[PDB]
Ligand binder design. Sequence first.
Ligand SMILES: Cc1ccc2ncccc2c1-c1cc(-c2c(C)noc2C)cc2[nH]c(C3CC3)nc12
Length: 109
Amino acid sequence: LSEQLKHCNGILKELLSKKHAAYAWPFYKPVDASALGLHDYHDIIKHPMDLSTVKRKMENRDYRDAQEFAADVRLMFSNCYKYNPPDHDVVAMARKLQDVFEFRYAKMP
Ligand SMILES: Cc1ccc2ncccc2c1-c1cc(-c2c(C)noc2C)cc2[nH]c(C3CC3)nc12
């Protein structure tokens, strides 16, 4: 499972890499609801998640297994699908980044 966590870290590095930046950027940092004018965000999203938080948790050895890591990445996408109308540009970006994630997560050793 150290090996599986390394695979997860590789995925995380890929999600944060320039290769995917055109659609990954909304997920780099926590949603700043006040700054974005989304004053209902924290009434709708109980557990915010974003890639910088996933990165901090990986660096701190918070995740004990791949499944725990994947649950946080998927929570990040689910929050996006929950809050935004399905035709929002951010949702199209989420779907593309989640495709990157799911196909590489499936290659877990
Ligand atoms: C609010 C908003 C409006 C139009 C957008 N158009 C394209 C992509 C994201 C858009 C955004 C936008 C959306 C989100 C976001 C995510 C992810 N999940 O739910 C929401 C809501 C985060 C953002 N962060 C930023 C800036 C970096 C600080 N913009 C955005």
